[PDB]
Design a protein around this ligand. Sequence first.
Ligand SMILES: *[C@@H]1O[C@H](CO)[C@@H](O)[C@H](O)[C@H]1NC(C)=O
Ligand SMILES: CC(=O)Nc1cccc2nonc12
Length: 353
Amino acid sequence: DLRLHLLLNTSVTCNDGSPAGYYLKESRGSRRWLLFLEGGWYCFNRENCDSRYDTMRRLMSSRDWPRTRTGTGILSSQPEENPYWWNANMVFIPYCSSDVWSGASSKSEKNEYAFMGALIIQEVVRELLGRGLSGAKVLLLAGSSAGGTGVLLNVDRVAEQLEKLGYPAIQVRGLADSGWFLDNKQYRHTDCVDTITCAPTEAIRRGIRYWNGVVPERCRRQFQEGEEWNCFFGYKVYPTLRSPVFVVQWLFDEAQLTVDNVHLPVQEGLRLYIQNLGRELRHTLKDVPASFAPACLSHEIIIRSHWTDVQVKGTSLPRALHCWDRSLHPLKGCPVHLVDSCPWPHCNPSCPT
Ligand SMILES: *[C@@H]1O[C@H](CO)[C@@H](O)[C@H](O)[C@H]1NC(C)=O
Ligand SMILES: CC(=O)Nc1cccc2nonc12
């Protein structure tokens, strides 16, 4: 299990002012640290953040958090379930800021909620240094869904922060799972009048000004003021990053199809859209040298119990991540770029059922 630790700096809080925290399994005999970022959508105005506080309060408050948690998938400590990093120090950071890990605004008398996702990550890193992280050699920042996007938004921040604090020997890397979205044309169109009819391109623009959200500096200087929402999209923010990032993304992500207003007898018009979405996602990963993109209709992977089962062209995800490890020291029989080529959901037989 991983034990809960509330942040000693109580000014860094969840949405409702309660302090944030992290769960930790520690491993003396290892200098490897896995920091996982939870996902769970977002909220971008007063009224849908109020609805989130009624039925998704654990994603906005820590007052009801459990006392331990069990690592699963890549966070497991059993080699049978986690052939990749079973012996590493494990950290699980609950997602309680609803800002795609981008906010930097406290609760005050102008703000009903606090959005401090970007600062939650700083404070966890700073407080973990005094518990072993100072002697680490690799800090892998991972996350799923909204946590996957938060990896891309924060991976260079964690590197830069450890450089100014006097720890230049720590190698910061990122693993973004199911956070590689496309701002594409929709299957049916609705203009942003409320929460259900507001596309992510436009909800995130409102979110940034509501959250006071931050983006990677070098991406900000490209799109400049008013256009920071572009940096929330994988193929646009990835080229500006310096830290090595491994990208995992289903070719037909269910969250991508949801925001595209697709709900699965498919006829022609829809057949082309689904096929065009798969080819478009492969085009964006063409220059991503460390990637893993099966042709399945699913969502999330790296922390599910059976994350070892999916294979792309004979290679499982934990093997590709191990091949990634060696490349950071083309390897014979140990590939890192694994993107399916068949063009319909479940054309790969190892897809999750
Ligand atoms: C707590 O965190 C805030 C925001 O990062 C910072 O301004 C403040 O100095 C911190 N306090 C301590 C005691 O570290
Ligand atoms: C759950 C989550 O974080 N979703 C998203 C983040 C960034 C861009 C997106 N485009 O569609 N969905 C997006």
